[PDB]
Design a protein around this nucleic acid. Structure first.
Lengths: 169, 159, 222, 58, 292
RNA sequence: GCUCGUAUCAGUUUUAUGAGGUAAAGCGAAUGAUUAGAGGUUCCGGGGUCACCUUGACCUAUUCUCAAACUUUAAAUAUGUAAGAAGUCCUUGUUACUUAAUUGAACGUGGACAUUUGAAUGAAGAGCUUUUAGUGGGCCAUUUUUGGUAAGCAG
RNA sequence: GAGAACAGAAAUCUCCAGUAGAACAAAAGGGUAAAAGCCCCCUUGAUUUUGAUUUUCAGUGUGAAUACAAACCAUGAAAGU
RNA sequence: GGUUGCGGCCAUAUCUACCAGAAAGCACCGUUUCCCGUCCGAUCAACUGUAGUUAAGCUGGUAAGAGCCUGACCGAGUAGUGUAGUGGGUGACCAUACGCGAAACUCAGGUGCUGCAAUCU
């Protein structure tokens, strides 16, 4: 039909939320470094809540974005514990999806002291080639309705790749 | 505490008219102003440096000074019992040409052109403008337009 | 503290002074129900529409609306039944009236400063009313015309000024005259909307029009 | 005690009794408030043309 | 979704070229504005745009009805002057700035003076005025949307114009190899960039390393069997060729404009009139009412 | 009094060109309020069948009424400028200004500009200065309008 | 609005829509969307000399503001500010 | 005539859905040694027009399309208003005379034109 209209992974964002600031953040930073091979950024607190122990501007989370073949490798090793199967939910209206895990330190690499055990959050941003047309500075436009991504297109791509299946529930 | 600020009673004067907010079109800058050109002040509230006073909205005056990014205009002011010559230093965003002059200019050229022709053939080309003279006589035919009879409509409630 | 006579506030002397972010301590309007009778009633059933029309320019207190609303409803429902009419109050009391309270006790000059600071505190609500507008609109069946006349002529006594009852040529609460409305209703042009009707427009998406008014198009092909 | 604080009554009648006359504009207006760069360039231009006209009339 | 009618009514669209995103008006607003005491004098913009596969450079002065162009110089015509492949590279960007600088100077009649630099040793040297002569032509670099960045090709053409006898103000800040610890530019490193040193060094590295990518990329250079050392030669030969004849020889223009219109119109979608619109709805209304 | 003698003028109209945001109009235009419904929900509560009768709002298409401190639009009257010899047109001279320039700007030199010297009407003389008196408690009337219930009330 | 372990109406991330319904130190109004908002980078022009002008106005002051000149700087790649 | 770059008027140009796109252009598209910039070559920067694509952008077309624009003897000379009266009305307001004169509604049409330069079956 059309070769390049096929979907591809754009970016995975590897999200983690930490209540406080301290050594937990430091080990949270470095576990993501040994996770992705690139340093993460400390997403900074936005407001005060008085119930989550949050003042404004206290850097209460860690995330990192992975793209390219390293993204293909890192989602595979992340979805293996997910078992290449996933709930019929979790798929956004744009077809992006995500889910959470409970540990990474000894999931794929050897565990070492003074790092703790952290659950965290995956989120995959998947869009077909041509995404620059809505991100470039000059001649910025949109993406046509056909070029958009939907649930059925994404879940179908989820099938043919990894031979995965949805709706394990 | 009565207020007489530099922008008082100016909620609507410095508005940006509907669907024309934002930046200003660039023909405002590319317009050329020479000293002596009659111009009329219209304050574009988008640009805040060098705004005119509220009294100067819609006033018209000649240009006596042209500066780096502004022109200087001479306005006549209603004060007491005599006019005073006011000098304003206004950004070009707040000023535009007065189209009254160009109509005088084009009429003069046509008036000059008629004078050149009346010099050669047909002198006394009636140079001066004549306002709407009273209608001259005419014949209004009835052919196919017989005067239909009209009567006032009876009053009814419409409600 | 008791209410003043209405002739104090009859004329439209002041500019509209509605409840707003600048006018916060406004008392609630006494009138609260504006549609009465079988209000969930369709349009075809009540062809007759009669209006209580003001011929004068004044202020009608919110309470006077409520009084006439009660008396007009009570009489008509007792005569022709609750479900035989739909009475609708047209005007809404948004103008806030102001009162300057004067102490009526002996020695009041000491505790009160006359009109130093005479800005009256909000006193009540009224509807500013003009010439030829509609105050009440009652739609009903042609049968029960005289009852609504008496109902609407028994409400005028509770309103200041000189009102008039005039029956309308418009079909109920529509803007269309009776023959013009029936032309559309005969030609499937009209869809009931609970208390009013939507008219098919010759402008807009033809798909939506066909979905909303299939009967008109079917009659076109017959 | 209390007195009429302000009024514009009779002001326009006063203003027009002697009339509001235009400022009687003059040829060669006041060369003031102009751009200084223009002004004392204009000085030298007027100097130069004066010498030229003076030599033209000899 | 569900764009409301009130939103459509109240939506003030930006200027057409802002809607397309091609023009940054806030920046043009201060380029094309001119010192009001310079009433009629145009303010020329040296506009450079890096579309894919071509470089667009032109000199533009604003009028009331629209921008007028003195003379333009693109990279499509560079094969005439000897630059064949990689018409988008940094070295070509320098050359096309040189070409337009030569072109405009000869169109204005100021070719004989302000030769810029005949020998390009890559040092920051503006084109100053000569003693008692016409001033150097002053044009202003309107890069447009693309970000200012050290070593960007947009400032490659900047160096091209300023080395072409055309006075465009600038600082050595954005030229490639601009050190931060010290404010010295590297003449050797620029001269490499002028002649493709950042390209020829990738020629030889890949050629020394492998042949797969070296044969995939740079295919036209392999077709002419030209080595990296010849890249400097061809760029020089272009420079003196540009300095020899910048007179803007156009193309041959076969199948001329009326014919160009003729073929386009056949494959050009037309617009219906009221009669077609009346007919189309009548057929559609009948179809939807035809026992549906 | 002075300088001059039909004007560089005008509490005016017309032509043209603007300026405003009141009246009115508007809420199936934004904002704030508003009466009536009609049709459609995620497990971000069904409170009872856990999807089965019972509702938990919002969105859509309408509908009624509004607004001094809301408004798309938008008057009337009032208001600014112009309606020429201090102008128009042509030529080439100055500048330390400006331009890439012998490019422009400003000031000009010379030369052509009566049926009407460039809209109407009028001008009663026009313009300018000096000096000084009194006054600096106001009040009424149509219209507009604020506070007040209103006032031969106050503003 | 759609979603995503812990995480729920609300802690962080991503997408779509989003004419401004936010922010702009502080009253209200005006004004601003590749910005006047947010984040980052660099700086002191919040400097000197005086004058001219606008508002209040007696065309006085004070305050505030506008546009320039001569500098000298800042910033930018520059126009420019 | 199409396309590009720079624009003018700044929606008759916008917005929602679908359709078509010969040639050329544009664009997506490919690779990080260099400059450069990021959590990430996604943006930016560089290198190649080569490996491909019209899917998208873009252009145009379609919609009794929303919107927007113009006009109407459409509403309506209506609301409103200037002037006048020893007009009416207790008043509220209204009528009339001489003038100016809308807005909403209704209907009709339309849905970019163009400047400079270059390029293209």
């Amino acid at each position: 039909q059309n070769p390049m209209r096929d979907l591809k992974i754009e970016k995975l964002v590897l999200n983690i939320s930490v209540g406080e600031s301290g050594d937990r953040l430091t080990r949270a930073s470095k576990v993501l470094e040994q996770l992705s091979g690139q340093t993460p950024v400390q997403s900074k607190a936005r407001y005060t809540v008085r119930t989550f122990g949050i003042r404004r501007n206290e850097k209460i989370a860690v995330h990192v974005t992975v793209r390219g073949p390293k993204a293909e490798e890192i989602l595979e090793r992340g979805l293996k514990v997910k078992e290449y199967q996933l709930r019929d939910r979790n798929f956004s209206a744009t077809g992006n999806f995500g889910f959470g895990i409970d540990e990474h330190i000894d999931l794929g690499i050897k565990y070492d002291p003074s790092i703790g055990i952290f659950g965290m959050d995956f989120y995959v941003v998947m869009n077909r080639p041509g995404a620059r047309v809505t991100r470039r500075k000059r001649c910025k436009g949109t993406v046509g309705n056909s070029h958009k991504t939907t649930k059925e297109d994404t879940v179908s791509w989820f099938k043919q790749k990894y031979d995965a299946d949805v709706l394990d529930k | 505490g009565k207020s007489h600020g530099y922008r008082s009673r100016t909620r609507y004067m410095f508005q940006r008219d509907f669907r024309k907010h934002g930046a200003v079109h660039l023909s405002t800058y590319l317009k050329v102003y020479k000293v002596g050109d009659i111009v009329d002040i219209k304050a574009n509230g988008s640009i805040q440096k060098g705004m005119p006073h509220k009294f100067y909205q819609g006033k018209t005056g000649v240009v006596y000074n042209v500066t780096k990014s502004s022109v200087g205009v001479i306005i006549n002011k209603m004060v007491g019992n005599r006019y005073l010559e006011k000098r304003l230093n206004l950004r070009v965003e707040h000023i535009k040409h007065s189209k009254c002059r160009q109509e005088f200019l084009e009429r003069v050229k046509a008036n000059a052109a008629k004078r050149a022709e009346a010099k050669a053939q047909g002198v006394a080309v009636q140079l001066k403008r004549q306002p709407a003279q009273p209608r001259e006589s005419r014949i209004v035919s009835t052919e196919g337009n017989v005067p239909q009879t009209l009567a006032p409509v009876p009053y009814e409630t419409f409600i | 503290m008791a209410r003043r006579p209405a002739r104090c506030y009859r004329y439209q002397k002041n500019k509209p002074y509605p409840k707003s972010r600048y006018n916060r301590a406004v008392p609630d309007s006494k009138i609260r129900i504006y549609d009465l009778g079988k209000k969930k009633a369709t349009v075809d059933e009540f062809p007759l529409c009669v209006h209580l029309v003001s011929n004068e320019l004044e202020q009608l207190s919110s309470e006077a609306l409520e009084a006439a609303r009660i008396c007009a409803n009570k009489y008509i429902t007792k005569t022709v039944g609750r479900d035989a009419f739909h009475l609708r109050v047209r005007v809404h009391p948004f103008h806030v009236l102001r009162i300057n309270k004067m102490l009526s006790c002996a020695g009041a000059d000491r505790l009160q400063q006359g009109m130093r600071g005479a800005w009256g505190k909000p006193h009540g609500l009224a509807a500013r009313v003009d010439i030829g507008q509609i105050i009440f609109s009652v739609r009903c069946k042609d049968v029960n015309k005289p009852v609504v006349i008496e109902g609407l002529r028994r409400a005028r006594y509770k309103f200041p000024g000189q009102q008039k009852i005039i029956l309308s040529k418009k079909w109920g609460f529509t803007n269309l005259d009776r023959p013009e409305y029936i032309k559309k209703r005969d030609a499937g042009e009209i869809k009931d909307d609970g208390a009013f009707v939507k008219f098919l427009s010759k402008k807009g998406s033809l798909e939506k029009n066909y979905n909303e008014f299939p009967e008109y198009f079917q009659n076109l092909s017959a | 005690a209390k007195s009429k604080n302000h009024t514009a009554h009779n002001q326009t009648r006063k203003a027009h009794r002697n009339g509001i006359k235009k400022p009687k504009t003059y040829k060669y207006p006041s060369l003031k408030g102009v751009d200084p760069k223009f002004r004392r360039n204009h000085k030298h231009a007027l100097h130069g043309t004066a010498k030229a006209l003076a030599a033209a009339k000899k | 979704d569900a764009k409301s009618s009130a939103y459509s009514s109240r939506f003030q669209t930006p200027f057409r070229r802002r809607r397309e995103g091609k023009t940054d008006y806030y920046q043009r607003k201060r380029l094309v504005t001119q010192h009001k005491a310079k009433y009629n004098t145009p303010k020329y913009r040296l506009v450079v745009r890096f579309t894919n596969k071509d470089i667009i450079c032109q000199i533009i002065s604003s009028t009331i009805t629209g921008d007028v162009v003195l003379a333009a110089a693109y990279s499509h015509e560079l094969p005439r002057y000897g630059i064949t492949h990689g018409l988008t590279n940094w070295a070509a960007a320098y050359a096309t700035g040189l070409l337009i600088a030569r072109r405009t100077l000869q169109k204005l009649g100021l070719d004989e003076t302000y030769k810029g630099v005949e020998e390009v040793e890559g040092e920051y040297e503006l084109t100053e005025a000569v003693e008692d002569g016409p001033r150097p032509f002053k044009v202003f670099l309107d890069i447009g949307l693309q970000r200012t960045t050290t070593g960007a090709r947009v400032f490659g053409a900047l160096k091209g114009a300023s080395d072409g006898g055309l006075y465009v103000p600038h600082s050595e800040n954005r030229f490639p190899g601009w050190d931060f610890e010290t404010e010295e530019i590297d003449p050797e490193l620029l001269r490499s960039y002028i002649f493709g040193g950042h390209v020829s060094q990738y020629m030889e590295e890949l050629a020394d390393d492998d042949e797969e990518r070296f044969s995939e990329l740079f295919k036209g250079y392999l077709a002419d069997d030209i080595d990296a050392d010849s890249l400097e030669d061809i760029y020089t030969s272009a420079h003196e060729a540009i300095r020899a004849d910048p007179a803007f020889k156009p193309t041959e223009k076969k199948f001329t404009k009326e014919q160009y219109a003729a073929e386009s119109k056949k494959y050009r979608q037309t617009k219906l009139s009221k009669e077609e619109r009346a007919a189309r709805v009548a057929a559609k209304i009948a179809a939807l009412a035809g026992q549906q």
